Design a protein around this nucleic acid. Structure first.
Ligand SMILES: [Mg+2]
Ligand SMILES: [Mg+2]
Ligand SMILES: [Mg+2]
Lengths: 144, 115, 136, 287, 49, 190, 62
RNA sequence: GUGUGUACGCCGGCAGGCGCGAACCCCAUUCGUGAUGGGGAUCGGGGAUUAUUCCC
C-alpha cells in the first residue's frame, strides 16, 4: 500500500508541494519576481504573491512524470495562446529566463540534477520527497 | 454604548487627481493619466500594499509611502525600461514633402507612359 | 497455473485504447492513473457507466489497465469505456462460465450498444439520392 | 466553516485557515448579519441599502434580493421550514418573505426604534422573536396579525436567544441578562448581572446546561442553566462583539471591536462455552 | 518553396517588376524560370517559378 | 442498480400528468441516463428525436447563439448548476420541475397563415405533441437567454428561475406569456 | 366547454395555403364512437393524441 | 507534412544574443452592468534584428 505521485490529484499535490517549499525555506528567489510577467502573451503579472513557489512545484512535478526536459521543454509546456489586436491569435511560448532560474533554484535544493543525455532530471532524494508529499495528500484526503 | 467604527476616506487627492475610495487600490490609482495597470501593480508591490483592500482603508502613512515610491522610481529599484520616459521631443515631419514629390514623380511617369 | 489475461481494443474516431484484463483485486487504471483522475471530469460518469451498471462485485476479481492514444478528449473517453466493457466481457467468456457473460453482455447492450460495438460515421445524404421518391 | 461579517466583506473561514476560504464583497457599505441555513448551503445577509440578500456559499452574486425595506437592515434569520426568511430593519418594521416565490408574505410594524436583534424557533415554524432599542421584546408568531406576547427590558436589547426545550427566552441589555419562560406568559424567572459593561452577545452551548455571555468588558461568562450561577470565566484582549461555538465545544470564536478575532481550538478472546478464570493484576508500589 | 522561390536584388521598385512580368529568367546552374508577381515587403522582390 | 441523473436526481418518482405528451418526453426507466451526453444520432430520421432524453434535448437547445456553438461540456455544466440551484431554492426533484415547465409551456392551438402583399389573413389550427415539446423547449431557452443578457446574473440562475416560474404556471416567465398570446390570437380568429 | 382529447386514426394529407397544415381524422377518447376531421400544425403521425380546446368546429364546413 | 537542405547549456523582463549535439475544453483567482479591467483605432517615449518586422 505505497502511495505514489500518480495516485493523488495533481492540482492538490501542486498546492501542497509549493507550501512545503515555502515553509522549509532554503529556496533562492530572484529579485525581479515582483516586476515581471511569466510570458510575452500575458497582459498582467500573476495575482498570487508566491507564484515562484507554485512554478517550482509545478516544474518538479513535470520532471517526475517526464524526465530529461530542458529549458526549451519547460518553455513549450507553459506556453499558450496569444491575442494580438485585430490579428488572428497564435500559439506563444513562455519566458526562458523564468524557467531557467526555477531549474537552478531546484538544483540548489539537491533535488534536480543534470542529465547525461541533456537537460535535467530528478535526484533520488527529490523522488523520495515527492513520494512523501504524495503520501500526505492521500492520507489527508482519506481522513476527511 | 460606545463603539467607534474605523474611518473610511470616500475620496482621495493624489498628484492633483481625485481617486475614488470605493475602488480596489490597484484599479483606483490608475485614474492618473501617467499610471496604467502594470505600473500600479509594480508600485504597490514595491510599497508592500495589501491588494485585497479598497483605497479608502489605506492609512495616511501608506498613502505617503505610495507617493514616495511613485515619485522616485530609481531609488526603489524600478527598472528604466518599465518607466514612461517622456522626453520633450516633437520633431517636424518632412515625410509629407517627400510623399508629394513621389506623387508628382508618379504623375510624371503616367504622363510619360501616356506619351 | 498459467497466467490468465485478455487484451482487447476500443476505438472512437482517431482514438485507440488497448485494455488488458487479468486476475486481480479490482484495480482499474488508465495510462498509469486511476479512473477518477482522468480529465475532463465533466464526463467522468461516462467513464464509470459499466461499473455502475454491473456493481463492484463483478469487478472485484479482475485488474484492468488501459493505454489510450490519439484523438481528442471526448473520443478518448468513449474509447476507454468501450475497451473496459469489451475486456470484461472477453475475460468472463474465457475464464468464467458462459451464462454470466450472457447476462452481463445483454445488460451492456440494453443500456448502450456503443459500449461493445463501434459504429463509425459514414457519409450519407439526400444529395446522393435522386429527386423525388423512389416510387410514386 | 464560520462566516465572519466585517465592514463590507463577508468572509467564510474554514478550520484553521487564517486566510478566508471565500469572500463576498459586493457591498457598498457594511453588510450585516450573515447567518447559515440548517443545510449549510445558503446564507442570508443584510445591507445598509435595505435589501435582504440570499447567497449561495459557492457563488459570487446573490440569488434573491428583497427590496421592501426603506433603510438599513440589521437582522435576518431562517425559519423551521428552510424556505422562508424573517427580517427586521431600521425603519421600525419586520417582514416575512418567501424564498421561491420571491415576494413579501407579511409585514409587522409594532416597534418605536431600531430593530436590531431577531431570533427564530427551530421547533415551531412561524414562531419568531425580535428585539429593538425601544427597550421592548415582542414575539410575533402563529398565524395572526398581532403580537401574542410582549416582554419589557430596561435597556436597549442587544441580543435575544431562545432555549430549545421548555421555551426559555434570554435577553441581554446593558449589564442585565434576563430569563423569561413561556409556560407562564411574561414570567421573569431570573435576572443576572456579572459584567461591568454592556452585554453584547449571548450564545448557547451544544449541551443545554452551559450558557455563554460576552460583553464589552472583554470577559465571557459561562453559566449553568440548572443552577443559574457562574461556572466559568474567559478573559480577552479586546471587547467581544461576537461569540460563536462550533459542534460540541470544538472551536470557540470571538470577534472584537478591532479587526483581529480569536479562535480557540481544543490477543485472543474468550469463547462463550469456555469457563473464565481470572488472574490477579500486579499492583505497583510507589518508590 | 520547392519550385517557387522569392528573389531580391534584381529590381528596386514594384513598378519595375510589373514591366518585366512573364520574362524568362535562369540560374547560373541552368535551371529556367518565369517571373510571376511582385511581392510587398521588399520593394523590389518578386515571386518566380 | 438505480440510475440517477448527475448521480443524485432520481427518475422513478418523476411522473407525467399529460396523456398526450407521455410518448414524446423521454425521462423514464429505459431513457434514464447518468449524463445528458450520449453522442447519439437523433436527427438522422424523422420522429427519432422523441427517443432522445429530454435533458439532452435541453442541453442541445442551449448551445446558442453562435458564440456557444459546439461547446457541449459547458452547457452540461450549466444544466447541472441550474438543477442544483432549483433543488436548493425549492427542495423538490428538478426533473419534475423541468417536466412541469415543458408541459405548461407548450401551446395547444396555433394559427396558420395565408398571406399576400396587402394583408395576411389568419386561421386557427391544432398543434402536434412533438411541436408542442419543441416549442416549449425553444421558448424556455430563449427566455433564459434574454434574461441573462447584459445583466449581472449567471445564465444558470436565469434558467433556474425560468423553469421555476414555468412549472409554477406564473405569468412572470417569458414562455408562459408567449404561449398565452399565441393561444389568444388563435382563439380570437376561430 | 370542457377540454377534449382525440386520437389520430388516419392521416389524410397536407393542406393549408402553403401545405403547412395536415388534415387528419380523429376519434374522441370518450365512448361516444365519434370521429371528425381536424387541421394540425407540425409533424404528426398515426397514434398521436391531440388536445382540442373546442371540439365542435369542423375543418371542412361551408 | 525529410532533396547534403535545430535538442540541450549560459545571460537578459521580453524581443534576442551567445555556444555546442495545439487551440478550444476543464478546475480555481480577480473584476463587474458603469463605453466597464469589454474594444484596441489614434498618439508619445524606449529597446533588439539584418530601411525591415517584432518587443516594453
Ligand atoms: Mg472559468
Ligand atoms: Mg473604456
Ligand atoms: Mg478598456
Amino acid at each position: 500500500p505505497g502511495v505514489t505521485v500518480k495516485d493523488v490529484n495533481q492540482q492538490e499535490f501542486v498546492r501542497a508541494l509549493a507550501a512545503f517549499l515555502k515553509k522549509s525555506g532554503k529556496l533562492k528567489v530572484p529579485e525581479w519576481v515582483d516586476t515581471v510577467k511569466l510570458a510575452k502573451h500575458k497582459e498582467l503579472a500573476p495575482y498570487d504573491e508566491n507564484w515562484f513557489y507554485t512554478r517550482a512545484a509545478s516544474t518538479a512535478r513535470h520532471l517526475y512524470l517526464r524526465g530529461g526536459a530542458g529549458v526549451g521543454s519547460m518553455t513549450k509546456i507553459y506556453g499558450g495562446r496569444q491575442r494580438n489586436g485585430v490579428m488572428p491569435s497564435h500559439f506563444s511560448r513562455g519566458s526562458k529566463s523564468v524557467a531557467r532560474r526555477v531549474l537552478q533554484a531546484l538544483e540548489g535544493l539537491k533535488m534536480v540534477e543534470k542529465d547525461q543525455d541533456g537537460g535535467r532530471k530528478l535526484t533520488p532524494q527529490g523522488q523520495r520527497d515527492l513520494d512523501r508529499i504524495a503520501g500526505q495528500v492521500a492520507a489527508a484526503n482519506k481522513k476527511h | 454604548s460606545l463603539v467607534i467604527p474605523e474611518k473610511f476616506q470616500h475620496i482621495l487627492r493624489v498628484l492633483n487627481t481625485n481617486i475614488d475610495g470605493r475602488r480596489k487600490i490597484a484599479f483606483a490609482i490608475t485614474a492618473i493619466k501617467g499610471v496604467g495597470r502594470r505600473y500600479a501593480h509594480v508600485v504597490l508591490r514595491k510599497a508592500d500594499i495589501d491588494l485585497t483592500k479598497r483605497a479608502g482603508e489605506l492609512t495616511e502613512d501608506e498613502v505617503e509611502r505610495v507617493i514616495t515610491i511613485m515619485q522616485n522610481p530609481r531609488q526603489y529599484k524600478i527598472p528604466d525600461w518599465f518607466l514612461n520616459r517622456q522626453x520633450x521631443x516633437x520633431x517636424x515631419x518632412x515625410x509629407x514633402x517627400x510623399x508629394x514629390x513621389x506623387x508628382x514623380x508618379x504623375x510624371x511617369x503616367x504622363x510619360x507612359x501616356x506619351x | 497455473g498459467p497466467l490468465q489475461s485478455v487484451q482487447v481494443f476500443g476505438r472512437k474516431k482517431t482514438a485507440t485504447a488497448v485494455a488488458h484484463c487479468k486476475r486481480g483485486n479490482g484495480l482499474i487504471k488508465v495510462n498509469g492513473r486511476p479512473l477518477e483522475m482522468i480529465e475532463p471530469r465533466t464526463l467522468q460518469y461516462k467513464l464509470l457507466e459499466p461499473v455502475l451498471l454491473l456493481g463492484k462485485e463483478r469487478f472485484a476479481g479482475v485488474d484492468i489497465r488501459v493505454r489510450v492514444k490519439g484523438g481528442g478528449h471526448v473520443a478518448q473517453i468513449y474509447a476507454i469505456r468501450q475497451s473496459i466493457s469489451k475486456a470484461l466481457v472477453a475475460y468472463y467468456q474465457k475464464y468464467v462460465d458462459e451464462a454470466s457473460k450472457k447476462e452481463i453482455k445483454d445488460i451492456l447492450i440494453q443500456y448502450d450498444r456503443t459500449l461493445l460495438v463501434a459504429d463509425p460515421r459514414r457519409c450519407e445524404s439526400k444529395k446522393f439520392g435522386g429527386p423525388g421518391a423512389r416510387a410514386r | 466553516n464560520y462566516a465572519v461579517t466585517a465592514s463590507s466583506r463577508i468572509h467564510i473561514y474554514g478550520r484553521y485557515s487564517q486566510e478566508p476560504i471565500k469572500t463576498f464583497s459586493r457591498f457598498k457599505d457594511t453588510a450585516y448579519c450573515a447567518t447559515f441555513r440548517q443545510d449549510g448551503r445558503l446564507l442570508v445577509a443584510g445591507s445598509e441599502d435595505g435589501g435582504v440578500q440570499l447567497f449561495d456559499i459557492s457563488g459570487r452574486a446573490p440569488l434573491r434580493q428583497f427590496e421592501g425595506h426603506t433603510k438599513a437592515v440589521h437582522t435576518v434569520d431562517f425559519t423551521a421550514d428552510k424556505y422562508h426568511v424573517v427580517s427586521g430593519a431600521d425603519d421600525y418594521t419586520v417582514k416575512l418573505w418567501d424564498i421561491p416565490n420571491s415576494k413579501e408574505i407579511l409585514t409587522f410594524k409594532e416597534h418605536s426604534d431600531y430593530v436590531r436583534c431577531g431570533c427564530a424557533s427551530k421547533l415551531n415554524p412561524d414562531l419568531f422573536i425580535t428585539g429593538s432599542y425601544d427597550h421592548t421584546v415582542k414575539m410575533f408568531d402563529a398565524r395572526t396579525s398581532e403580537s401574542v406576547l410582549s416582554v419589557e427590558h430596561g435597556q436597549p436589547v442587544e441580543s435575544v436567544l431562545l432555549f430549545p426545550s421548555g421555551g426559555l427566552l434570554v435577553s441581554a441589555g446593558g449589564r442585565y441578562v434576563k430569563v423569561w419562560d413561556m409556560l407562564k406568559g411574561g414570567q421573569l424567572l431570573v435576572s443576572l448581572k456579572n459584567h461591568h459593561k454592556t452585554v453584547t452577545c449571548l450564545c448557547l452551548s451544544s449541551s443545554g446546561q452551559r450558557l455563554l455571555s460576552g460583553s464589552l468588558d472583554r470577559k465571557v461568562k459561562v453559566y449553568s442553566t440548572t443552577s443559574y450561577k457562574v461556572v466559568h470565566s474567559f478573559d480577552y484582549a479586546a471587547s467581544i462583539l461576537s461569540l460563536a461555538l462550533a459542534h460540541e465545544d470544538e472551536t470557540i470564536v470571538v470577534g472584537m471591536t478591532n479587526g483581529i478575532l480569536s479562535v480557540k481550538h481544543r490477543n485472543y478472546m474468550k469463547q462463550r462455552d469456555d469457563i473464565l478464570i481470572n488472574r490477579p493484576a500486579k499492583k505497583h508500589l510507589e518508590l | 518553396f520547392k519550385n517557387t522561390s522569392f528573389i531580391k536584388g534584381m529590381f528596386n521598385s514594384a513598378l519595375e517588376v510589373a514591366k518585366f512580368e512573364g520574362a524568362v529568367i535562369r540560374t547560373v546552374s541552368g535551371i529556367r524560370g518565369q517571373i510571376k508577381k511582385a511581392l510587398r515587403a521588399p520593394e523590389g522582390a518578386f515571386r518566380a517559378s | 442498480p438505480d440510475i440517477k441523473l448527475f448521480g443524485k436526481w432520481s427518475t422513478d418518482d418523476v411522473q407525467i400528468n399529460d396523456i398526450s405528451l407521455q410518448d414524446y418526453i423521454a425521462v423514464k426507466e429505459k431513457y434514464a441516463k447518468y449524463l445528458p451526453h450520449s453522442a447519439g444520432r437523433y436527427a438522422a430520421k424523422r420522429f427519432r428525436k422523441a427517443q432522445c432524453p429530454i435533458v439532452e434535448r435541453l442541453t442541445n437547445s442551449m448551445m446558442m447563439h453562435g458564440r456557444n456553438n459546439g461547446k457541449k461540456l459547458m452547457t452540461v455544466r450549466i444544466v447541472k448548476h441550474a438543477f442544483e440551484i432549483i433543488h436548493l431554492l425549492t427542495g423538490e426533484n428538478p426533473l419534475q420541475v423541468l417536466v412541469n415547465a415543458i408541459i405548461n409551456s407548450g401551446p395547444r392551438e396555433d394559427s396558420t397563415r395565408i398571406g399576400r402583399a396587402g394583408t395576411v389573413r389568419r386561421q386557427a389550427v391544432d398543434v402536434s405533441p412533438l411541436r408542442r415539446v419543441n416549442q416549449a423547449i425553444w421558448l424556455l431557452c430563449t427566455g433564459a437567454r434574454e434574461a441573462a443578457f447584459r445583466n449581472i446574473k449567471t445564465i444558470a440562475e436565469c434558467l433556474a428561475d425560468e423553469l421555476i416560474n414555468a412549472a409554477k404556471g406564473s405569468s412572470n416567465s417569458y414562455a408562459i406569456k408567449k404561449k398565452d398570446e399565441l393561444e389568444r390570437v388563435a382563439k380570437s380568429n376561430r | 366547454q370542457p377540454i377534449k382529447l382525440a386520437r389520430v386514426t388516419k392521416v389524410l394529407g397536407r393542406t393549408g395555403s402553403q401545405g403547412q397544415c395536415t388534415q387528419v381524422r380523429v376519434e374522441f377518447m370518450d365512448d361516444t364512437s365519434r370521429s371528425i376531421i381536424r387541421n394540425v400544425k407540425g409533424p404528426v403521425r398515426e397514434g398521436d393524441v391531440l388536445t382540442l380546446l373546442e371540439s365542435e368546429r369542423e375543418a371542412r364546413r361551408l
